[PDB]
Design an enzyme around this catalytic site. Structure first.
Site, short mmCIF file in Angstrom:
data_model
loop_
_atom_site.label_atom_id
_atom_site.label_comp_id
_atom_site.label_asym_id
_atom_site.label_seq_id
_atom_site.Cartn_x
_atom_site.Cartn_y
_atom_site.Cartn_z
N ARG C 364 -26.77 -26.05 8.60
CA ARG C 364 -25.84 -27.07 9.51
C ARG C 364 -26.62 -28.09 10.01
O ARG C 364 -26.35 -29.22 9.88
CB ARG C 364 -25.67 -26.01 10.96
CG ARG C 364 -24.73 -24.73 10.67
CD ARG C 364 -24.29 -23.97 11.71
NE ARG C 364 -23.56 -23.18 11.76
CZ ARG C 364 -24.05 -21.84 11.29
NH1 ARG C 364 -25.39 -21.56 11.70
NH2 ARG C 364 -23.08 -21.02 11.08
N1 LIG Z 1 -14.12 -29.24 9.18
C1 LIG Z 1 -15.26 -28.78 8.63
N2 LIG Z 1 -15.47 -29.47 7.28
C2 LIG Z 1 -16.36 -28.96 6.61
N3 LIG Z 1 -17.25 -28.02 7.03
C3 LIG Z 1 -17.19 -27.22 8.01
C4 LIG Z 1 -15.92 -27.64 8.91
N4 LIG Z 1 -15.59 -26.79 9.90
C5 LIG Z 1 -16.91 -25.85 9.84
N5 LIG Z 1 -17.58 -26.24 8.64
C6 LIG Z 1 -18.62 -25.42 8.20
O1 LIG Z 1 -18.66 -24.10 8.61
C7 LIG Z 1 -19.66 -23.68 9.49
C8 LIG Z 1 -19.15 -23.43 11.05
O2 LIG Z 1 -20.00 -23.18 11.84
P1 LIG Z 1 -19.83 -23.30 13.57
O3 LIG Z 1 -18.33 -23.73 13.73
O4 LIG Z 1 -20.74 -24.37 14.15
O5 LIG Z 1 -20.45 -21.93 14.08
P2 LIG Z 1 -19.58 -20.62 14.91
O6 LIG Z 1 -18.29 -20.76 14.06
O7 LIG Z 1 -20.40 -19.47 14.52
O8 LIG Z 1 -19.51 -21.39 16.37
C9 LIG Z 1 -20.53 -25.12 9.68
O9 LIG Z 1 -21.74 -24.61 9.30
C10 LIG Z 1 -20.05 -26.05 8.72
O10 LIG Z 1 -20.98 -26.22 7.65
#
Ligand SMILES: Nc1ncnc2c1ncn2[C@@H]1O[C@H](COP(=O)(O)OP(=O)(O)O)[C@@H](O)[C@H]1O
Ligand SMILES: Nc1ncnc2c1ncn2[C@@H]1O[C@H](COP(=O)(O)OP(=O)(O)OP(=O)(O)O)[C@@H](O)[C@H]1O
Ligand SMILES: [Mg+2]
Ligand SMILES: [Mg+2]
Lengths: 175, 471, 500, 469, 144, 71, 118
Positions: C364
């Site tokens: 991330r």
């Molecule tokens: N709209 C998007 N476009 C590209 N990658 C995404 C998108 N949404 C999430 N991701 C990927 O999915 C992962 C979601 O992490 P995150 O939502 O921050 O953690 P959590 O769901 O545990 O809170 C991230 O590492 C990101 O790389």
């Protein structure tokens, strides 16, 4: 679960009574306290009441039990602070049960149809005290006439039934 | 002049014994300030709140910081009120703790400021307002298949690493600037890293001085992670009650509220309920959750990320919060693994606002036809898995041929995901995603490849990406 | 409803002096012993979390300070502790001896030397449980943590200060990835720490010997909690590793801390909680099994410039079962960390080592941590692997259109042969940049699949004697050199390389 | 004085009370010996292992035999140490139980023999071996495809009917022949008739005069079966430490160890963890299997049959053993019915040791090429089934004609099978089997018939079996 | 332990009294929310074994276009027939027959052989039954 | 067949200890003929009933239960 | 009361002849055995119960006893009015402890119907 928790307290009071060397003044006082608490049952409901503070309950014990011995008073004031005043007559009875092992005396109950004379009572007491290992033996007689012309003796948990057990074993071995 | 000893210290949970008749109440704050008399003692500044009464003048409490250092027989100062939180427009532009104290190093709030208690009864039935209006977000799944309600509660259900922090940050990027009313971000039990990134994004994007921020992140002992949602909530309740102001309230991982309740409930003397959760799982998240409401004075539109443990939507902590939310978006691990971002299940996501008298008849029937083709393709999944595509009877082949395009066109590139991939991101109005899905369902875009529809804002960019691929 | 302090001689010494005032002691006697968990009457001036010392010499941690007894957790071998032993309190809350003089030693979670090279002369102690750096204490991750593994440094890059999970089944190369990214820190200013939790002592001994061979014990510290050690020492090994890293973090140094199998810590904490009869939850882990790892891994920060600038980057390991990334402990640790490296099992059986599933491995925060040349070079690397894997998943046989026939499949096969490495040999970042450049720009389309490894091995020796200008440019300016000279260098090697 | 008194008896769990300050430490042994003084009472000889301390001067123990007859109040003698087991030369050739007493009818061990404690801490970090050495078994399919480590844990996944006991007897014979190494068998919770069958087969083999056995079989209480692998292992530790030699240690069905500890923990009243396992699953398995290491003086290597309950490798009882395994040797039934002895499956048997740093480069290349040719030949089975033997190609026909020579060459003549087939049997070193598979893979021995390669020791004596036919 | 007794103690209170007691009735409509459609959970199998039939609502039929989402094949009435009027009974018999026939014959129509006309008429009949049995929201229809 | 067989009955209306003690009575009647030199065949019809009755005895005596409440 | 002893039972298996052809042919009833009806509503379970009572009390002279243990007071009243209508009620004795009653009554209803049949 209640009898073993009474036994812990009674063994602690027994150890402090054997260590302090004031055994008779402890024993007769705990007997008097057990008699007084078996006389009235409303005193436990008085000491279980929540609006009375703990200092008022402690002063109530110190006023009502002002004549008791000092280790007994300390034991009962520890029992009050642990919410264990509903457990005191069982520990008093087990304390009087455990102190007679130190004296060596056992308490026996004899069911006889006729009231036996004191000479035969003393003879059987000495005989089964030499048998069981006691220095002396205390015999409590009963006036129950259901026995067939005999006496049955109870030494703790081991009984000596010889009154109607002859006819019972006869009608058991006949069939 | 009544103080209390400490009897028991059991991890997060402290027993306190007062004099007779001077027990505080349930939920009052108790303070401990110890001064470390010798070298075998530790300075302590600790706040406790009451959870129970146990009899014999004892009080079962829950601590708000780490209890490492408490000695039995240490004295406790009662306060006579719950945890009082400084509130007003003093809170605008500041970052806060669980106890209301500021953590953003810009100063301390004066003692004569107004302080509201954390705990209060919910708004009554006669005060509530139930007008349903659509909040435009610019996300195509959210705008087409589960519209958000301006003034109602909103869920972001997901597993771990599936896309709900990205979705909550893009909802802030698409809503919170142009909102024209107070925002409150109360982060409950997520990464302390993501409390820093988000704060510096509020600083440089100029959003803050309208946003109050409350962080009780996952380093905190669970007594803090419970009451953090309630101190952010009382900060927002000041605005919607006293100022009549329209409030945004973003809570990240309100699951961690019930998890922090579950961590303390074993030590509070409670029996465990099914799945190890506390018995009061449904009412601890009913006393929190019924204070986030739109009343007649003002409206709180609240978007709440909800973690779903072990990707198990039947777990009692996500299953008992579906009944509180107006709009939900159920993220799925499979859609994130196929590359479809947002990973919103189009069928498990529902809303109160998808109805023809609210959203429009063209919007409604395009949304229902989209759901119909995706459900038919979901029924065909097993035949496609075993027998393959070659058995389907020339209408099911067309339904698969359209549903690949639909479930790829629901995916969208975000402004927040520009740092992930470099693609600059898109904002799509509601009428244009309705027009794009109607033109997909009409059959106007059957000749394009299906990988041309991934991560694309509007359908002219589908045409542009397919020309760049070389069709 | 028996209480544990109801002991007969103990009640006797309580009615020794009830109303007469008794000065209270700072020693206590044990009531119960069992399964590494004790209780002791006495010790009323003990505080929660204090180190208490038994008469045997075994340390202990006082968890529960109940009304008339102290729940003690025995930190060590408990078979010499009897009921009636006296417990003495020390006065310190869970301290490990931490210093500069602890570097190159192998210690247990209480800071006692286990390798048997003598005592450890440290003057300063650090608490095991301590608050994480707050929201204003941190700074965004901007410095590269160079692992020397090409697939990590290209696809899922680690920044100095982030927590990235390394996840995979058993026998998939997690420990080798750890020892490679510890051996690579020799030129950098990184102080590595290897925390081995629940491993075999034989493999920890061979790990320490392969660290000593590559000179890695000049900066690394090994904290060992075995499989035979009791669960209270398994529970405290990561907290001891963090408390030994924070001394260097809050002095401005940069620390890498590696947790080999935090699943072992979670299992030992499940043990230590169920022996305390705390009611279990999902998969019988306790309620605070999340907070167990979050109190640990949130304490690993990139500090701000107002606090010195130190950093604790954490590489925790979680062992799955049959590749299940959606279990309870993997999804607990995923939602704490800043990414995962999914070491896949059948890629490890097929020969691809490091067997990174690049579809499910995310970083991330990384991407702002690559060195401005690896960005340009690897942004066109990652999608080649992605497209190649999900089209070799179905296009096993049959003729294909010429783009998807060769320019996807053969380029992906060249990527897979580029990214393979042999263990304990880290490549510097400039040579990674030049090899992935020569791959992605198309200079490996002529060379067959079986010769890519020897091409790389001979190209490194070519660079070390000719391309010192290229390597010094990537050292100093961190950007790619001008592409005319760099293409000239690669074509000058391709004139030399003998294809087989 | 250390005399005790029984309070509670409930199944195997016996609570014993001593006096204050005279408590036994945890894991000690308690001798209960009672001569019945009247016709009511029953004679008792019974040993207890201390497991907890309950307070009130009491001690909760688990029993090693049946508790029938134990009276509340009878005398218990504290030994002052855990279960002391005889070690030395006097244990070789003798069948023992968990208490170190001879099951056999041969005789009793005298009281002046050396007895060492059952519970010992694992050997320290200072004392282990830095390098990884190879354990040379003389079996070709073991020493080539799944090589062993001095100080290793090896898993047998055979079952019955594949010759597991034949491998056990030949590993004992080969290590005690070439390496001078005593073996120890330990049947943790096994069928008693199969224990007697194993003892008569090792007596007929003649291998026993060099091994020592421990049977705590299924009829015994769970406190016995939890401690049986420890008293096989304590017999192995004497020859590791005092003698300094490479010792084998066979634990038959260590899943019986895990579930024996599970039911001990259920009797002790602990809250059960995931899948019904005792909370202390991984640390009881660690306290067993971290004493199986290679120190500076000797080693203990271990071969352990594993149950694989409801045949998934993700159940915690296989999963906490597989984190200690260094090798697996799968025994397959279709290789025993084909005529290849031993029945070791060449493609499923894996090893952590099979790597060029540990073993060497030439061994690794030859072994991986053998696995590649057998994998290609296993792929070609359906093609031979539907297309026939002809018209495949020249290349894969050479692959079949090479790989069946390799597949039949993996069988040896054991020294164990000499009383069954009359063939004297052979110890094949690892350099000569690498050279033999290398010379087969080059095609040098391709023209010989494939039945010369069956049941032959090395590559110099396949020429004579081709010469005889 | 007494969770079945909890639900049954209130659901037996919903009765139709006789003409001596006045003839007044109390019909009830309890709801049970399943979790991912497991009928075999604990509280659903306690409430199913009390009520006089059930109406299964499914999301598979909600998103395929059938609103109300009644799985009328699995939905049971335990009075049924004694509830309906004569005119509803006469035609609900043959509607239940051909909807059960279409639910049987739809199983052999997702792939493959493209069935003959003799049951293609029944499939068209059943698709018209499914299209009749849909409604809008808050539009109740009288019996006639 | 009742010239050589013995039938030992613990039917379902009897209490759980007789159901528990039926198979041990089976081997205790068989081991006499086994150690006299004869060959015995003992048939235990539904040991699962015996396991469930021992489960009932261990649960009503307050013993800590394992899997499926079997002790 | 205790169960009947070992020597009090019948040594042979005899067949309870019902007069119903599915039962008499394909699943015969033991005279003294235990039968399972697996049916809901619409299957005529009450009509099958009534013709069992009618045929047994016609051809064997056997009284029946219906013991309704915790099942649907509505169906119990339907079954009682169908007993009254059929006219076979004067042969049966009915015991109802339904779901509305505490579990002591639902525990003991089967046993009081049993002591009426004994
Ligand atoms: N709209 C998007 N476009 C590209 N990658 C995404 C998108 N949404 C999430 N991701 C990927 O999915 C992962 C979601 O992490 P995150 O939502 O921050 O953690 P959590 O769901 O545990 O809170 C991230 O590492 C990101 O790389
Ligand atoms: N890049 C590589 N090239 C060749 N071999 C490798 C590579 N990486 C790892 N290995 C080998 O793989 C084997 C297993 O890896 P490793 O033990 O590090 O995984 P692990 O997950 O720690 O296993 P376990 O959890 O069982 O200890 C090691 O023997 C190592 O030699
Ligand atoms: Mg998040
Ligand atoms: Mg490892």
């Amino acid at each position: 679960n209640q009898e073993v928790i009474a036994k812990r307290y009674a063994s602690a009071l027994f150890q402090i009574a054997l260590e302090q060397g004031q055994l008779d003044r402890i024993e007769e006082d705990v007997r008097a306290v057990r008699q007084a608490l078996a006389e009235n049952g409303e005193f436990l409901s008085l000491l279980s009441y929540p609006k009375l503070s703990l200092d008022q309950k402690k002063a109530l014990i110190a006023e009502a039990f002002a004549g008791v011995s000092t280790p007994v008073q300390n034991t009962l004031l520890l029992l009050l602070e642990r919410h264990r005043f509903g457990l005191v007559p069982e520990l008093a009875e087990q304390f009087l049960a455990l102190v007679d092992d130190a004296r060596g005396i056992a308490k026996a109950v004899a069911y006889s149809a006729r009231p036996l004379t004191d000479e035969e009572l003393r003879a059987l007491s000495d005989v089964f005290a030499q048998k069981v290992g006691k220095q002396t033996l205390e015999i409590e007689n009963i006036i129950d006439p259901e026995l067939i012309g005999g006496v049955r003796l109870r030494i703790g948990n081991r009984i000596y039934d010889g009154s109607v057990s002859g006819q019972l074993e006869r009608i058991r071995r006949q069939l | 002049m009544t103080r209390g000893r400490v009897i028991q210290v059991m991890g997060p949970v402290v027993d306190v014994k007062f004099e007779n008749g001077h027990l505080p109440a349930i939920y009052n704050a108790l303070k401990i300030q110890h001064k470390a008399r010798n070298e075998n003692e530790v300075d302590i500044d600790l706040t406790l709140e009451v959870a129970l009464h146990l009899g014999d003048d004892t009080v079962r409490t829950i601590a708000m910081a780490s209890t490492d250092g408490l000695i039995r027989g240490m004295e406790v100062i009662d306060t006579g009120a719950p945890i009082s939180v400084p509130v007003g427009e003093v809170t605008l532009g500041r970052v806060f703790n669980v106890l209301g104290e500021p953590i953003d190093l810009e100063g301390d709030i004066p003692a004569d400021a107004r302080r509201d208690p954390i705990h209060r009864p919910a708004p009554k039935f006669e005060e509530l307002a139930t007008e349903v209006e659509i909040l435009e977000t610019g996300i195509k799944v959210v705008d087409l298949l589960a519209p958000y309600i301006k003034g109602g509660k909103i869920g972001l259900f997901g597993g771990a690493g599936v896309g709900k922090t990205v979705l909550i940050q893009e909802l802030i990027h698409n809503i919170a600037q142009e909102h024209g009313g107070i925002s409150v971000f109360a982060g409950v039990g997520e990464r302390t890293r993501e409390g820093n990134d988000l704060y510096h994004e509020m600083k440089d994007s100029g959003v803050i001085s309208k946003t109050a921020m409350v962080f009780g992140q996952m380093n905190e002992p669970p007594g803090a992670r419970m009451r953090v949602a309630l101190t952010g909530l009382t900060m927002a309740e000041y605005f919607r009650d006293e100022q009549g102001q329209d409030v945004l309230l973003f809570i990240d991982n309100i699951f961690r509220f019930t998890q922090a309740g579950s961590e303390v409930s074993a030590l509070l003397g409670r029996m465990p309920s099914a799945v190890g959760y506390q018995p009061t799982l449904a009412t601890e998240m009913g006393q929190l959750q019924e204070r986030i409401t739109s009343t007649a004075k003002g409206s709180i539109t609240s978007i709440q990320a909800i973690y779903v443990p072990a990707d198990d939507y039947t777990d009692p902590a996500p299953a008992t919060t579906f009944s509180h939310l107006d709009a939900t978006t159920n993220l799925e691990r499979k859609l994130a693994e196929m590359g479809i971002y947002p990973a919103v299940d189009p069928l498990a996501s529902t809303s109160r606002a998808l109805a023809p008298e609210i959203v429009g008849e063209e919007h409604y029937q395009v949304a229902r036809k989209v759901q119909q083709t995706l459900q038919r393709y979901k029924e065909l999944q097993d035949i496609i898995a075993i027998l393959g595509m070659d058995e389907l009877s020339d209408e099911d082949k067309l339904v698969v041929h359209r549903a690949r395009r639909i479930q790829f066109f629901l995916s969208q590139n975000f402004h927040v995901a520009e740092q992930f991939t470099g693609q600059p991101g898109s904002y799509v109005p509601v009428k244009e995603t309705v027009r794009g899905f109607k033109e997909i369902l009409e059959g106007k875009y059957d000749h394009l490849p299906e990988d041309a529809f991934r991560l694309v804002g509007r359908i002219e960019e589908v045409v542009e990406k397919a020309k760049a691929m070389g069709v | 409803s028996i209480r544990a302090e109801e002991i007969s001689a103990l009640i006797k010494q309580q009615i020794e002096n009830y109303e007469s005032q008794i000065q209270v002691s700072d020693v206590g006697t044990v009531i119960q012993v069992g399964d590494g968990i004790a209780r002791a009457h006495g010790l009323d001036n003990v505080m929660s979390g204090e180190l208490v010392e038994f008469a045997n010499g075994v340390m202990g941690m006082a968890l529960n300070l109940e009304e008339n007894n102290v729940g003690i957790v025995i930190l060590g071998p408990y078979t010499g502790i009897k009921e009636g032993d006296e417990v003495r309190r020390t006065g310190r809350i869970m301290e490990v001896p931490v210093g500069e003089a602890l570097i190159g030693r192998v210690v247990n979670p209480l800071g006692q030397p286990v390798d048997g090279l003598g005592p450890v002369e440290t003057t300063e102690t650090r608490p095991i449980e301590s608050p994480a750096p707050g929201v204003m204490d941190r700074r965004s991750v901007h410095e590269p943590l160079q692992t020397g593994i090409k697939a990590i440094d290209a696809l899922v890059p680690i920044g100095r200060g982030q927590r990235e999970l390394i996840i995979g089944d058993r026998q998939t190369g997690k420990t080798s990835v750890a020892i490679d990214t510890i051996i690579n820190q020799k030129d950098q200013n990184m102080i590595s720490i290897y925390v081995a939790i629940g491993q075999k002592e034989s493999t920890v001994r061979t790990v320490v010997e392969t660290l000593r061979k590559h000179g890695a014990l000049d900066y690394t510290i090994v904290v060992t909690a075995s499989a035979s050690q009791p669960a209270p020492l398994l529970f405290l090994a990561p907290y001891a590793g963090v408390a030994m890293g924070e001394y260097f973090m809050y002095k401005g140094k940069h620390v890498l801390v590696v947790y080999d199998d935090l699943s072992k810590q979670a299992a030992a904490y499940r043990e230590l909680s169920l022996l305390l009869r705390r009611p279990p939850g999902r998969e019988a882990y306790p309620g605070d099994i999340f907070y167990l790892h979050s109190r640990l891994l949130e304490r690993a920060a990139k500090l701000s410039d107002a606090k010195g600038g130190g950093s604790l980057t954490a590489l925790p390991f979680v062992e799955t079962q049959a590749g299940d990334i959606s279990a309870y402990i993997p999804t607990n640790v995923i939602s704490i960390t800043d990414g995962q490296i999914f070491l896949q099992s059948d890629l490890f059986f097929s020969g691809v080592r490091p067997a990174i599933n690049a579809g499910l491995s995310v970083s991330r925060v990384g991407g702002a941590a690559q060195i401005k040349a690896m960005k340009k070079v690897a942004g066109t690397l990652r999608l080649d692997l992605a497209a190649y894997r999900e089209l070799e998943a179905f296009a096993q046989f049959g003729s294909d259109l010429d783009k998807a026939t060769q320019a996807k499949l053969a380029r992906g096969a060249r990527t897979v042969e580029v990214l393979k490495q042999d263990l304990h040999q880290p490549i510097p970042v400039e040579k990674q940049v030049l090899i992935i450049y020569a791959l992605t720009r198309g200079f490996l389309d002529d060379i067959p699949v079986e010769d890519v490894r020897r091409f790389e091995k001979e190209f490194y020796l070519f660079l070390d004697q000719n391309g010192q200008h290229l390597l010094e440019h990537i050292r100093t300016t961190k950007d790619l050199p001008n592409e005319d000279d760099l293409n000239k260098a690669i074509e000058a090697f391709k004139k030399t390389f003998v294809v087989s």
